[PDB]
Amino acid sequence: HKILHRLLQ
Amino acid sequence: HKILHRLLQ
Amino acid sequence: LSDEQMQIINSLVEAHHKTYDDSYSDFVRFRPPVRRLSMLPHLADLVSYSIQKVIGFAKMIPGFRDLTAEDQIALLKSSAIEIIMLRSNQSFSLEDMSWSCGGPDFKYCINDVTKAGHTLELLEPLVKFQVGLKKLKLHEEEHVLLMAICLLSPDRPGVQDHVRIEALQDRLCDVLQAYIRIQHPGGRLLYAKMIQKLADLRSLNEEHSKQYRSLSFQPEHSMQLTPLVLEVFGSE
Amino acid sequence: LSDEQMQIINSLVEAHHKTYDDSYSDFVRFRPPVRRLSMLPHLADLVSYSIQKVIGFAKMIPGFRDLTAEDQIALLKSSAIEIIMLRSNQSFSLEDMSWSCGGPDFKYCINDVTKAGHTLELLEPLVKFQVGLKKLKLHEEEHVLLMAICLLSPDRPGVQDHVRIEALQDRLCDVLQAYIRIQHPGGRLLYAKMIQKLADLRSLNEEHSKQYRSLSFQPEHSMQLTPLVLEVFGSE
Ligand SMILES: C=C1/C(=C\C=C(/CCCCCC)c2cccc(CCCCCC(C)(C)O)c2)C[C@@H](O)C[C@@H]1O
Ligand SMILES: C=C1/C(=C\C=C(/CCCCCC)c2cccc(CCCCCC(C)(C)O)c2)C[C@@H](O)C[C@@H]1O
């Protein structure tokens, strides 16, 4: 979940 | 490489 | 309504306005609609775009940012499609029985999603859900509270801090109950109907997951999805 | 030219015609160009589309289908960007120093790729490569042979059957040498120039891989790529 983690700052 | 394998039939 | 209940309502409404564009002007940047599975590219981009907006909305829900990154992801993954279903009601129309998002290109009927890899077994209860939810004629405060309550459901797979999340949702359910009682005439039975909608979303969630799994297992179809979509609806 | 050399030429030319659309009418289905990294979505879809075409072309190269699936993938992954660079010369124009692919929307200059995550350190030798290759004024038979020779290079990472692949490429280099000698007036020095182009592609390949790695490590940029692109240029 690298994208989700990034989007969640 | 599941996509590549599929596209290569 | 107390001041704290009021602040919660204000921030949630502002969060939605910041993450829901009524002009739908970003839709031109998606892969265009094609009318097999010709509608999957447009649908994938639309859903991917919507997930980013749901994330934006969630981060402004009071108490959500204090949660664990794992809990945030667990809640997001399991409820993503339900929030999308809820937020899509804003574009849904009872006149056309369809989602009207700006121009003629972005007027989506039930047949469009059929041409996108999903069946009537999902779409028939979906449209029925959309009709019933629209008929409730929610205030923006209520519709916004419903999305936040849905997202903070503790009964999701992968969640760890059930008590901290159930507390947040309770505090939100409290606000909704109070708002309806004080600000919504003839809404004596409305709250019970809204909770029933959350139950409807679980069944819709389940059916979507089955049909997504069918879709994602075929590389020729999964290659049409976006990395974000694969990550959110994926089993990893 | 012998009959076997002729059959090889025929099949390769037909393979290219079946995988290269001169109208570029599929480009309207890509995420539209936006003029940060506003051009990355369109570029990603264009490259992803082109990879599918390169795969189609490769499968019709004589001897390629008999190779191991692993060797086919290894050759494809390592040479994909080089074949794209080669095949893009068909749309490149010396008048505009740009790739003209149909309408005004799909007329790509060097600044467009800059707005897509790549720097002049790649684009400057790329355009220079495009100019030099165009100036060679290849016959369609030669341009098509060059792509096939490039793809069947045994000196790629991950290849296992070096002898079987080097043999196929030799057989192809033989055809190219013969064709130029018999069918191309004043091409006495052309073959050496074409081999030099293959050397140019290695340096371009290297620079692209570095800049792709920079791009793919940032989730906000990698999320704009396609699953196929991630798979082909990925390190997995
Ligand atoms: C996404 C939104 C809109 C419409 C939504 C809609 C209505 C459909 C509009 C687009 C039709 C092509 C919809 C809603 C829930 C479920 C579905 C079925 C597809 C589920 C996800 C697809 C996949 C990941 C491949 O499994 C469609 C349009 C606006 O209301 C914005 C809102 O966020
Ligand atoms: C792809 C094609 C065309 C143009 C190609 C071009 C010219 C550029 C056209 C599009 C500009 C937005 C190009 C060629 C090689 C390398 C590059 C740089 C980008 C490398 C891949 C990007 C990534 C995977 C993100 O690292 C561009 C256009 C037609 O000739 C078809 C041909 O297959």
XYZ file of C-alpha atoms and ligand atoms in Angstrom:
556
model
C 0.000 0.000 0.000
C 2.643 2.541 -1.034
C 0.196 4.782 -2.911
C -2.359 4.865 -0.084
C 0.366 5.589 2.464
C 1.614 8.489 0.340
C -1.868 9.937 -0.211
C -2.483 9.759 3.542
C 0.624 11.968 3.840
C 5.016 -10.446 -15.223
C 1.400 -11.624 -15.445
C 0.386 -9.017 -18.034
C 3.364 -9.692 -20.316
C 2.799 -13.442 -20.075
C -0.849 -12.979 -21.050
C -0.056 -10.662 -23.969
C 2.494 -13.194 -25.225
C -0.441 -15.643 -25.301
C -26.975 20.927 19.095
C -23.878 21.743 21.143
C -20.904 23.761 19.894
C -18.731 20.664 19.495
C -21.443 18.914 17.481
C -21.661 22.067 15.376
C -17.907 22.283 14.749
C -17.937 18.648 13.630
C -20.729 19.371 11.151
C -18.993 22.479 9.788
C -15.664 20.730 9.206
C -17.278 17.720 7.531
C -19.345 19.886 5.180
C -16.283 21.949 4.254
C -14.303 18.744 3.697
C -16.904 17.491 1.229
C -17.058 20.782 -0.676
C -13.271 20.639 -1.019
C -13.397 17.083 -2.384
C -16.586 17.095 -4.470
C -16.603 19.206 -7.634
C -20.146 20.010 -8.794
C -18.925 20.959 -12.279
C -17.250 17.582 -12.867
C -14.681 19.448 -14.968
C -11.904 16.950 -14.194
C -13.775 14.189 -16.034
C -12.335 15.331 -19.368
C -8.914 14.154 -18.176
C -10.112 10.563 -17.777
C -9.796 8.030 -20.564
C -12.932 8.870 -22.581
C -16.113 6.738 -22.495
C -16.577 4.238 -25.332
C -20.105 3.114 -26.211
C -15.488 -5.546 -25.130
C -15.560 -3.857 -21.720
C -15.231 -0.575 -23.599
C -16.326 1.470 -20.578
C -13.806 -0.056 -18.161
C -11.031 2.487 -18.882
C -13.305 5.469 -18.191
C -14.851 3.780 -15.149
C -11.415 2.874 -13.780
C -10.186 6.464 -14.067
C -13.412 7.775 -12.541
C -13.204 5.391 -9.587
C -9.479 6.062 -9.130
C -10.153 9.795 -9.123
C -12.985 9.301 -6.627
C -10.773 7.263 -4.290
C -8.349 10.196 -4.086
C -11.276 12.441 -3.155
C -12.549 9.986 -0.539
C -9.063 9.938 0.984
C -9.086 13.737 1.082
C -12.487 13.694 2.781
C -11.444 11.029 5.294
C -8.312 12.902 6.372
C -10.531 15.776 7.518
C -12.927 13.595 9.505
C -12.293 14.496 13.175
C -10.240 11.739 14.801
C -9.363 9.870 11.609
C -5.855 11.309 11.281
C -5.015 10.288 14.851
C -5.687 6.652 13.963
C -2.933 4.232 12.976
C -1.848 4.350 9.329
C -2.814 0.675 9.220
C -6.280 1.368 10.634
C -6.698 4.277 8.216
C -5.827 1.986 5.305
C -7.962 -0.882 6.628
C -10.974 1.422 6.970
C -10.295 3.001 3.580
C -9.903 -0.259 1.643
C -12.987 -1.936 3.093
C -15.296 1.079 2.836
C -14.005 2.780 -0.330
C -16.689 1.417 -2.643
C -19.429 2.241 -0.117
C -18.355 5.881 0.150
C -18.210 6.054 -3.647
C -21.740 4.631 -3.782
C -22.883 7.190 -1.204
C -21.183 10.209 -2.764
C -22.396 9.259 -6.253
C -25.993 9.873 -5.151
C -25.298 13.596 -5.608
C -25.019 13.081 -9.378
C -27.829 10.515 -9.538
C -31.155 11.633 -10.999
C -34.609 10.116 -10.542
C -35.771 11.555 -13.864
C -33.204 9.675 -15.943
C -32.434 6.880 -13.455
C -28.796 7.666 -14.157
C -25.697 9.538 -13.016
C -25.505 12.895 -14.802
C -22.038 14.422 -14.451
C -21.942 17.553 -16.598
C -21.934 16.987 -20.343
C -23.683 14.376 -22.525
C -20.503 12.289 -22.556
C -20.626 11.923 -18.781
C -24.263 10.872 -18.461
C -23.954 7.302 -17.206
C -26.782 4.772 -17.402
C -26.880 1.215 -16.058
C -25.800 -0.194 -19.430
C -22.527 1.740 -19.278
C -21.352 -0.100 -16.167
C -22.444 -3.347 -17.821
C -19.958 -2.483 -20.568
C -17.346 -2.077 -17.829
C -17.163 -5.599 -16.418
C -19.979 -5.607 -13.866
C -23.309 -7.430 -14.048
C -26.941 -6.687 -13.206
C -26.507 -8.743 -10.032
C -24.649 -5.716 -8.655
C -26.215 -2.899 -10.666
C -29.866 -3.771 -10.019
C -29.575 -3.449 -6.233
C -27.247 -0.475 -6.772
C -29.781 1.569 -8.739
C -32.458 0.476 -6.257
C -30.182 1.713 -3.473
C -29.621 5.003 -5.321
C -33.367 5.521 -5.766
C -34.147 4.858 -2.106
C -31.308 7.049 -0.854
C -32.352 9.907 -3.137
C -35.941 9.604 -1.911
C -34.742 10.227 1.643
C -33.886 13.756 0.467
C -31.007 14.210 2.895
C -29.751 17.573 4.067
C -26.129 18.128 3.061
C -25.282 17.853 6.761
C -26.882 14.400 6.920
C -25.496 13.033 3.646
C -22.053 14.157 4.786
C -22.496 12.596 8.239
C -23.572 9.313 6.652
C -20.336 9.065 4.652
C -18.253 9.762 7.764
C -20.193 7.239 9.849
C -19.813 4.621 7.110
C -16.060 5.214 6.888
C -15.561 4.912 10.651
C -17.247 1.511 10.928
C -15.291 -0.726 13.345
C -16.711 -3.935 11.849
C -14.248 -4.092 8.953
C -11.564 -6.683 8.128
C -8.049 -5.789 9.266
C -8.952 -3.225 11.919
C -6.987 -3.349 15.172
C -8.283 -0.585 17.442
C -11.991 -1.455 17.485
C -12.770 0.591 20.601
C -11.176 3.843 19.416
C -12.966 3.614 16.066
C -16.346 2.598 17.500
C -16.082 5.603 19.822
C -15.499 7.979 16.905
C -18.446 6.521 14.998
C -20.693 6.720 18.073
C -19.773 10.378 18.520
C -20.714 10.839 14.858
C -23.965 8.884 15.150
C -24.783 11.142 18.104
C -24.387 14.243 15.953
C -26.583 12.771 13.218
C -29.344 11.806 15.668
C -29.290 15.270 17.214
C -29.242 17.121 13.884
C -32.248 15.220 12.535
C -34.223 15.801 15.745
C -33.492 19.531 15.892
C -33.062 20.599 12.257
C -35.166 18.167 10.210
C -38.999 18.340 10.407
C -40.750 14.989 9.973
C -37.477 13.104 10.293
C -38.707 11.069 13.257
C -38.052 7.847 11.349
C -35.211 9.107 9.128
C -32.276 7.957 11.271
C -33.454 4.337 11.253
C -33.726 4.481 7.461
C -30.173 5.808 7.155
C -28.769 3.016 9.326
C -30.632 0.555 7.109
C -28.787 2.117 4.159
C -25.478 1.234 5.806
C -26.711 -2.359 5.937
C -27.585 -2.158 2.240
C -24.049 -1.001 1.485
C -22.542 -4.125 3.064
C -24.410 -6.392 0.644
C -23.463 -4.121 -2.252
C -19.857 -4.125 -1.026
C -19.844 -7.921 -0.944
C -21.223 -8.270 -4.468
C -18.748 -5.733 -5.843
C -15.801 -7.564 -4.277
C -16.851 -10.804 -5.967
C -17.230 -9.152 -9.366
C -13.990 -7.208 -8.918
C -12.145 -10.416 -8.080
C -13.509 -11.929 -11.293
C -12.251 -8.894 -13.182
C -8.836 -8.522 -11.543
C -7.911 -12.167 -12.170
C -7.920 -11.576 -15.929
C -4.709 -9.685 -16.862
C -6.290 -8.252 -20.032
C -8.868 -6.527 -17.829
C -6.720 -5.774 -14.783
C -4.214 -3.994 -17.037
C -6.945 -1.432 -17.721
C -7.146 -0.517 -14.032
C -5.060 2.103 -12.231
C -2.341 1.390 -9.638
C -4.468 3.066 -6.950
C -7.548 1.008 -7.822
C -5.512 -2.217 -7.769
C -4.086 -1.239 -4.389
C -7.392 -0.302 -2.748
C -9.507 -3.215 -3.995
C -6.587 -5.647 -3.994
C -6.159 -8.479 -1.510
C -2.516 -7.729 -0.700
C 18.317 -12.218 -51.966
C 17.207 -15.818 -51.450
C 13.599 -16.948 -51.019
C 14.018 -17.480 -47.275
C 15.494 -14.000 -46.857
C 12.535 -12.703 -48.852
C 9.923 -14.518 -46.751
C 11.517 -13.073 -43.614
C 11.281 -9.555 -45.043
C 7.654 -10.014 -46.121
C 6.498 -11.309 -42.735
C 8.302 -8.565 -40.814
C 6.853 -5.807 -43.000
C 3.349 -7.250 -42.645
C 3.854 -7.527 -38.881
C 4.713 -3.833 -38.661
C 1.746 -2.752 -40.784
C -0.509 -4.754 -38.464
C 0.953 -3.071 -35.374
C 1.593 0.487 -36.578
C -1.440 2.648 -37.351
C -0.561 5.577 -39.630
C -3.773 7.416 -38.714
C -3.008 7.375 -34.977
C -6.768 7.178 -34.414
C -6.402 5.272 -31.130
C -4.694 8.262 -29.501
C -8.063 9.822 -28.656
C -8.628 6.998 -26.162
C -5.551 7.958 -24.136
C -5.751 10.330 -21.200
C -5.604 13.676 -23.041
C -2.459 15.858 -23.174
C -2.265 18.735 -20.685
C -0.071 21.729 -21.528
C 3.152 19.406 -12.490
C 4.072 16.529 -14.805
C 0.851 17.299 -16.659
C 1.920 15.290 -19.713
C 2.760 12.109 -17.792
C -0.757 10.606 -18.029
C -0.885 10.989 -21.822
C 2.712 9.805 -22.216
C 2.073 6.793 -19.975
C -0.959 5.727 -22.014
C 0.931 6.288 -25.266
C 3.903 4.218 -24.114
C 1.637 1.504 -22.688
C -0.236 1.338 -25.983
C 3.063 1.178 -27.876
C 4.344 -1.678 -25.704
C 1.306 -3.750 -26.701
C 2.128 -3.047 -30.348
C 5.797 -3.947 -29.873
C 4.696 -7.240 -28.318
C 2.464 -7.880 -31.326
C 5.369 -7.143 -33.666
C 7.792 -9.331 -31.706
C 5.481 -12.355 -31.724
C 5.640 -12.344 -35.528
C 9.429 -12.114 -35.717
C 10.570 -15.503 -37.095
C 11.980 -17.596 -34.251
C 10.834 -15.349 -31.408
C 7.788 -17.435 -30.484
C 9.920 -20.578 -30.218
C 12.007 -18.924 -27.503
C 11.358 -19.453 -23.800
C 8.636 -17.278 -22.265
C 11.347 -16.049 -19.902
C 13.685 -15.161 -22.773
C 10.814 -13.461 -24.601
C 10.082 -11.365 -21.511
C 13.768 -10.670 -20.831
C 14.275 -9.465 -24.407
C 11.042 -7.468 -24.312
C 11.713 -5.696 -21.004
C 15.288 -4.706 -21.820
C 14.631 -3.567 -25.391
C 11.102 -2.133 -25.114
C 12.161 1.506 -24.897
C 14.627 1.065 -27.778
C 11.963 -0.347 -30.098
C 9.658 2.506 -29.088
C 12.449 4.964 -29.907
C 12.987 3.253 -33.266
C 9.324 2.984 -34.240
C 8.641 6.588 -33.197
C 10.927 7.811 -35.992
C 8.025 7.182 -38.385
C 6.075 10.036 -36.771
C 9.134 12.253 -36.289
C 9.532 15.238 -38.608
C 12.666 17.202 -39.477
C 10.601 20.282 -40.319
C 9.123 20.638 -36.837
C 11.765 18.653 -34.920
C 8.832 16.881 -33.308
C 6.575 13.828 -33.362
C 3.438 14.597 -35.378
C 0.741 11.992 -34.735
C -2.407 13.135 -36.526
C -4.157 16.143 -35.031
C -2.801 19.303 -33.355
C -3.360 17.720 -29.942
C -0.963 14.900 -30.782
C 1.916 17.011 -32.079
C 4.602 16.387 -29.469
C 7.630 18.637 -29.015
C 10.588 18.186 -26.667
C 8.947 20.382 -24.019
C 6.003 17.987 -23.748
C 8.184 15.125 -22.526
C 9.848 17.572 -20.134
C 6.381 18.082 -18.653
C 6.179 14.299 -18.281
C 8.994 13.622 -15.823
C 12.022 13.334 -18.102
C 14.915 15.768 -18.484
C 16.997 17.197 -21.326
C 19.765 14.767 -20.366
C 17.646 12.106 -22.081
C 15.709 14.197 -24.592
C 18.670 16.034 -26.129
C 20.422 12.851 -27.277
C 16.999 11.410 -28.153
C 16.104 14.170 -30.611
C 19.670 14.017 -31.946
C 19.182 10.277 -32.422
C 15.841 10.881 -34.163
C 17.406 13.417 -36.532
C 20.292 11.131 -37.474
C 18.051 8.100 -37.953
C 15.641 10.082 -40.129
C 18.546 11.343 -42.238
C 19.470 7.745 -43.051
C 16.193 7.610 -45.001
C 15.637 3.901 -44.430
C 13.542 1.713 -46.686
C 10.588 0.223 -44.817
C 12.338 -3.139 -45.166
C 15.425 -1.770 -43.405
C 13.638 0.157 -40.647
C 11.639 -2.989 -39.924
C 14.761 -5.181 -39.919
C 16.475 -2.791 -37.510
C 13.672 -3.149 -34.951
C 13.803 -6.947 -35.205
C 17.595 -7.018 -34.900
C 17.435 -4.710 -31.876
C 14.822 -6.899 -30.183
C 16.820 -10.095 -30.723
C 19.991 -8.773 -29.084
C 21.582 -11.506 -26.922
C 23.497 -8.990 -24.788
C 20.578 -8.194 -22.480
C 20.162 -8.780 -18.728
C 18.259 -11.933 -17.784
C 18.700 -13.849 -21.034
C 19.473 -17.561 -20.752
C 19.803 -18.971 -24.271
C 22.459 -16.627 -25.671
C 23.400 -18.901 -28.577
C 19.865 -19.434 -29.897
C 19.153 -15.699 -29.778
C 22.486 -14.619 -31.271
C 21.813 -17.050 -34.122
C 18.417 -15.485 -34.837
C 19.909 -11.990 -34.807
C 22.780 -13.062 -37.077
C 20.292 -14.525 -39.547
C 18.505 -11.164 -39.406
C 21.698 -9.127 -39.774
C 22.443 -11.283 -42.822
C 19.141 -10.314 -44.421
C 19.753 -6.624 -43.730
C 23.272 -6.720 -45.203
C 22.007 -8.487 -48.311
C 19.002 -6.196 -48.798
C 21.107 -3.033 -48.612
C 23.668 -4.434 -51.066
C 21.077 -5.559 -53.614
C 18.158 -3.141 -53.191
C 19.683 0.101 -51.890
C 21.865 2.241 -54.218
C 24.646 4.150 -52.456
C 24.107 2.205 -49.247
C 27.690 0.943 -49.174
C 28.205 2.528 -45.756
C 24.589 2.352 -44.534
C 24.814 -0.924 -42.599
C 27.664 0.353 -40.422
C 25.616 3.458 -39.625
C 22.625 1.345 -38.594
C 24.730 -0.777 -36.237
C 26.040 2.458 -34.733
C 22.402 3.408 -34.098
C 21.975 0.253 -32.023
C 24.924 1.444 -29.941
C 23.236 4.830 -29.550
C 20.107 3.103 -28.270
C 22.023 1.432 -25.431
C 23.106 4.799 -24.024
C 19.578 6.143 -24.458
C 18.217 3.003 -22.788
C 20.553 3.508 -19.838
C 19.582 7.149 -19.347
C 15.873 6.340 -19.564
C 16.182 3.610 -16.928
C 17.797 6.060 -14.509
C 15.116 8.693 -15.059
C 12.350 6.086 -14.897
C 13.711 4.802 -11.596
C 13.610 8.369 -10.274
C 10.004 8.621 -11.415
C 8.754 5.217 -10.260
C 10.085 5.701 -6.720
C 7.637 8.553 -6.134
C 4.147 7.051 -5.559
C 2.410 10.267 -6.673
C 4.058 9.844 -10.076
C 4.082 6.050 -10.319
C 0.324 6.023 -9.680
C -0.057 7.821 -13.014
C 1.560 4.922 -14.875
C -0.205 1.854 -16.262
C 0.128 -1.710 -14.915
C 1.821 -2.778 -18.163
C 4.329 0.081 -18.030
C 5.155 -0.703 -14.388
C 5.638 -4.356 -15.304
C 7.864 -3.778 -18.340
C 10.133 -1.081 -16.894
C 9.947 -2.480 -13.366
C 12.804 -4.249 -11.611
C 10.733 -7.201 -10.391
C -17.693 7.880 -8.762
C -18.643 8.794 -8.749
C -19.737 8.820 -9.728
C -20.491 7.748 -10.109
C -20.417 6.415 -9.607
C -20.978 5.285 -10.112
C -21.810 5.193 -11.359
C -21.061 4.796 -12.627
C -20.449 5.972 -13.367
C -19.469 5.562 -14.455
C -19.989 4.514 -15.416
C -18.946 4.060 -16.408
C -20.743 4.043 -9.331
C -20.810 4.060 -7.942
C -20.573 2.905 -7.222
C -20.265 1.728 -7.876
C -20.190 1.686 -9.259
C -19.821 0.412 -9.980
C -18.326 0.293 -10.290
C -17.466 -0.104 -9.100
C -15.978 0.149 -9.285
C -15.426 -0.403 -10.596
C -14.291 -1.414 -10.468
C -13.192 -0.900 -9.549
C -13.724 -1.779 -11.832
O -14.833 -2.613 -9.883
C -20.435 2.851 -9.980
C -19.957 10.167 -10.378
C -19.961 11.308 -9.378
O -21.130 11.253 -8.557
C -18.716 11.233 -8.517
C -18.709 9.922 -7.747
O -17.555 9.855 -6.914
C 5.407 5.911 -28.793
C 5.400 6.337 -30.041
C 5.460 7.761 -30.398
C 6.324 8.678 -29.874
C 7.369 8.444 -28.932
C 8.090 9.349 -28.221
C 7.922 10.841 -28.263
C 7.030 11.439 -27.180
C 5.557 11.467 -27.550
C 4.643 11.788 -26.379
C 5.036 13.012 -25.581
C 4.165 13.225 -24.367
C 9.143 8.786 -27.338
C 9.946 7.739 -27.777
C 10.912 7.208 -26.945
C 11.085 7.712 -25.670
C 10.297 8.753 -25.208
C 10.456 9.287 -23.804
C 9.506 8.642 -22.791
C 9.922 7.252 -22.335
C 8.820 6.458 -21.650
C 8.110 7.232 -20.544
C 8.149 6.598 -19.157
C 7.726 5.137 -19.203
C 7.287 7.376 -18.174
O 9.509 6.652 -18.686
C 9.328 9.288 -26.053
C 4.407 8.197 -31.390
C 4.276 7.245 -32.564
O 5.430 7.319 -33.404
C 4.094 5.830 -32.052
C 5.314 5.423 -31.240
O 5.163 4.084 -30.777
